[PDB]
Symmetry: D2
Subunit: 379 residues, 4 copies
């Protein structure tokens, strides 16, 4: 694993220096978002040194060191390609196919060999970013990047705690007393998300993030195909909650399509779990079907807690869209299909908040029926 | 409708018969005696259950999915377990099981889905589906419900602890996020201490030993004798042992224990457990990071790491001096409790010294 | 499974009648490839009856009857959508999104839920086409369709026999005596393919196939995304042979991309096996590395048989391209990106035949070195 | 390098020591005796192997992948099996295994990958990697090579038969393509008959019973006794039994047999086998298609189907009267051979009548 080590050590050293030093130049500019005619020397070094190290890896050909080893390597290749994209060394709408031949072949080889997208994925920097003596992979040494990544990690892990609790209710049923504890575990995990997102909101520098962090999550070509950038939402957890709570519907083209466009962007194990939720029942419909149990102790106790969980999830979606996406994407973007991705994100936030709409299906009425169901039972 | 017919029976008459039978046993002076008592109730339980099982055995091969099959196997196991409790079947008395139909069915399902052909802990705890608030049980006794509910709470708390620990593996012990997982682990283990305490302060020692425990006895399935389920039949607890490095897979005593429980947990738990047997542990990781002693992450993470090991080892003594003390291989149970607690011993390998070295490693700071 | 049964029984009855009767009209025409202003009544019935049956299924929502049941249902939905595409009831370059709302949602739901493409796949009509009292799913009752499907099935099954034998050599090694038998089993299976393809070549009606069979394998939209038609080559087997024999290379963008574009078009189990071959060694390189064993009995005996297998595979690719694709696609198409897909198919045939080229990597030299290696050893 | 050091030993000195030892045993008059003979060679085999194993046990947890671990377990099992053959270790003589290091290592790997902690058939047959033409073996005797090679050929032929049969399931018995799979199945089963015949006509009855078979004896791993491998330890053969409907998973006798062999085959073979236990079979399918008697597919497919059942049942008698006849649970071996052959019996359920009904069903045509 000499060649593999050599590339990783490069990613954890010079790679960070080159990008950092390059970000310094971009920030000094007046445009700040411009990359043309700047750091031309640093770009050649980053491209050159990375390619050689990658080329050494591409020579070894087929290797089977296990999923973790392969995924880690693919991450470095993706981190490398992502940087080249940020610095305009490679640009999709400018090419017909990727100019980074070696890296593309290697990335497409590993990705297809382990069932993941042939590029940098969220897990590469968050849940599966191995730290060496305290430092883990990063594009730059900027404090704002670390804040973004760490809080995405905290957020993601909090959602996993919430989806795991929800999945354990399935075998017990909504009337099970133990389901009341899982429901509370779920509630706490979702609150950890609200808190996690708040801290990020109160510490991340809006400007530094939009000009020095975000530009590394851009779409770029791998081979001839264009692959979009990773999202902090690329993991089963969040969608597992949507389906299990019944807030979203797999039978709707809009939602299933979204799942399809993200499967390869998460771990194989997360894909398996997500797909399975698409053919399992949900708690919403369960409670709705238990109308003749309205005067049951477990019903009032569990429905009450359930409804609270549905609200927290919707709260977390409003917090994300209304606050996070708003303060670091929409605003800085108006100053410097954007209105399209914003509109999709809205239907998503409203789908979780269960608001009233006529253009899309929502649980507003179902949730209201259940809320008004708890009224009749407190007697 | 046969599956449901049997399930509905298990959730109704089955509970009545056992309950009514437990009433007779308790009135006795011996109370542990079952000979010449409830002979009528025993015949009914055996008879009604067999007929319902026989109807199922006729359908032959069925593939309704893992959950459906496991649930059915649970009812068959619950039925056979009852028969064992009431002496309708007794291992040291037989050469092979007298419950022919139930045995065939149980062995068929179990082997078909990779689980033991009898009632397993998950059948009554994590995978016990409730209907309108009531879930499978042997009797309607309050002490059974206390035992099962707290075993469930305990088990689920351990799963939260093992899941947090496994997420550190890809991040490493020096990762800042590993400090949060380590704290999540600490909290989950505390939930176990609290969970066990509540059980200790509410369960009726007598009712449990004469009306609850006798349903977890060993009985024959076919010609083979299969031991009773244990609240410790799940990956979680052993995942923590290996990940924290408190136990060693390279030791016959421990790997044998794992082998004797694999079939007693869910296939998914088996997969996870086996995997931990070929993965590194945090203990050795910290020990190998001696040249990082003056690192911020080393001081912070290690402290919590040691607090985690102490909560686990300590939560071990509590259990050891409870379901084992108040109620052959006694030594094998002491070594297990000693490895977890990392006590000092000369007969078995322990982390006592390694843990002390690490505790005193925080000293310099 | 009433609604599921109702739809299947429809697919096996009226569906076949409507398409058949419709094919009769198209054939009578002078253009014969025209579909405008013809069978307008039959089209409305096919579209109408199918949609209603699908709509009934879409209502049931999430169901978990097992992989086989779900895959079978998805097949009927795909068969239905494919027909609508053939009859121009739906056309990709004419739409922005699919006009078949219910069918799209259902197809995308099942597909994503079990990890397969949301449309009709080769297995749906070949290896996983269940027959009822002798009759299995089909678009029409035409004899030429049955010939096409049956021989694709025979061909596919023969390739599976060849890939399975090759994979069993891996744990034994190329010098193992038992590997000589597997190598012979492989040789026989590949010959069954040559024979299978020959029979198809000598019995299929070139015209009927191009105007009455092939038009059902066209690309159509599912939701907003366009999904290409199934190919008799959508299964692990063929590519497993390519990689195990070392005739193709996973480290090349061109090949890995091709694998990615077909994974969802085969069974999950075939995907698993294929991906794994991308990180395993191959026999070609093994033999090349055993140069200091040239005077070994197993070497001459096994290398000789190996080289024969490589030739048969290449023979089967030439037979397919030069004969089959030529007589039923290229010619009838010149009479009535086509030159693009033909060019890709050529690089593929030459990759297996191991011919000499400068534009792509081939085993021509490696195979020649090994052939000339057997000469030195027969002494 | 420890893994390779042990493997290279198994492929060199290990073979020499055992071979040289077999020479001494054969010269004797008893020939089956091992007491007071080759005492020097035994010490060397035990000593050299243990040291190499001890080096491996030190590395602790390793995750080099299933193939690497399984291969290593095989060497450890081959080593322990030899020690058993030479009486260096004997089950009915011990309470626990005297080979401490080897036991721990074997139990560790086996449990970590889900296989029995000893030498399994695949270790010498389908998964025995050859180096420059030579693959793992206990001795250099020609009769061992004959036994192993033909077991391998037999096994691979059965895998071809089970794979063809499983591909009919999704197509159905009335599918035209099922007629080809049925013929592929027929040919594969014939390859088995031929394979077994060659073994019968070449293997030296004496050399095999005194120099080959004694290496497949049962021995202790830890404290548990694990039986020796059988050329029948793989899914294939049992997949054919269930798919053809010749055997029944709902019968304790058969499901128990499956349970006692799962760990003796590859995890992938276990998965496939278990699944067959909850799937339909062709026998019952044909029986249920009585109102299709005058169908073309019914006549053609059924004929070949019956020829397949007869080849299997007949290939059973051959084996039964060979490795069992020429060389307790003898009855359980008769019933198995009788279910496969579908003979007439009153003590166990068989397909004799069902098969006769189907044979006479072709009569009307
Ligand atoms: C200021 C920081 C953040 C910003 C600027 C941000 C921005 C975005 C953007 C613009 C998208 C849309 C997808 C695309 O077109 O690529 C997205 C998706 C998503 N984000 Fe964030 N994000 C932030 C933090 C977080 C955190 C901490 C979480 C927690 C896990 C998270 C979870 C998600 C989810 C789950 C999705 C998908 C939509 C859905 O299914 O509802 N994000 N984010
Ligand atoms: C006259 C009958 C047949 C014709 C017209 C035909 C045509 C084609 C076409 C045009 C393609 C290109 C893919 C696309 O753009 O969709 C293709 C692919 C393929 N065909 Fe056929 N085919 C026939 C029979 C068969 C049979 C019997 C087999 C046997 C399994 C088969 C195996 C393949 C393979 C494996 C591929 C992929 C290319 C590769 O990886 O080499 N085809 N076929």
């Amino acid at each position: 694993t000499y060649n593999t080590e050599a590339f990783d050590e490069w990613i954890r050293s010079r790679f960070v220096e080159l990008n950092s030093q390059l970000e310094q130049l971009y920030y000094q500019q007046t445009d700040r978002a411009n990359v043309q005619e700047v750091g031309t020397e640093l770009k050649h070094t980053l491209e050159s040194e990375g390619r050689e190290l990658v080329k050494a890896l591409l020579d070894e050909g087929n290797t089977d060191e296990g999923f973790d080893s392969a995924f880690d390597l693919l991450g470095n290749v993706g981190l490398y390609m992502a940087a080249c994209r940020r610095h305009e060394i490679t640009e999709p709408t400018r090419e017909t196919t990727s100019p980074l031949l070696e890296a593309s072949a290697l990335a497409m080889h590993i990705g297809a060999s382990i069932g993941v997208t042939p590029r940098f994925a969220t897990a590469h920097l968050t849940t599966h970013n191995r730290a060496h003596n305290g430092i883990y992979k990063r594009f730059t040494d900027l404090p704002d990047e670390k804040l973004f990544v760490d809080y995405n990690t905290k957020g993601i892990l909090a959602y996993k705690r919430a989806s795991d609790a929800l999945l354990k209710i399935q075998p017990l049923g909504i009337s099970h007393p133990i389901s009341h504890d899982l429901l509370r575990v779920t509630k706490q995990a979702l609150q950890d998300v609200i808190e996690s997102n708040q801290q990020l909101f109160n510490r991340l520098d809006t400007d530094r993030f939009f000009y020095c962090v975000r530009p590394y999550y851009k779409p770029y070509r791998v081979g001839s195909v264009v692959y979009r950038g990773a999202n902090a939402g690329d993991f089963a957890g969040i969608n597992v909650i949507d389906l299990t709570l019944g807030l979203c519907f797999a039978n709707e083209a809009s939602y299933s399509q979204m799942l399809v466009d993200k499967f390869l962007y998460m771990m194989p194990e997360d894909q398996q779990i997500l797909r399975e939720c698409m053919r399992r029942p949900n708690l919403m419909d369960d409670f709705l079907q238990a109308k003749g149990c309205i005067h049951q102790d477990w019903y009032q106790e569990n429905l009450k807690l359930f409804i609270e969980v549905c609200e927290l999830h919707g709260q977390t979606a409003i917090q994300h869209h209304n606050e996070l996406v708003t303060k670091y994407i929409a605003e800085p973007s108006v100053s410097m299909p954007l209105h399209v991705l914003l509109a999709s994100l809205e239907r998503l936030r409203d789908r979780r908040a269960a608001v009233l709409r006529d253009d899309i299906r929502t649980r507003y009425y179902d949730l209201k029926k259940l809320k008004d169901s708890l009224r009749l039972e407190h007697h």
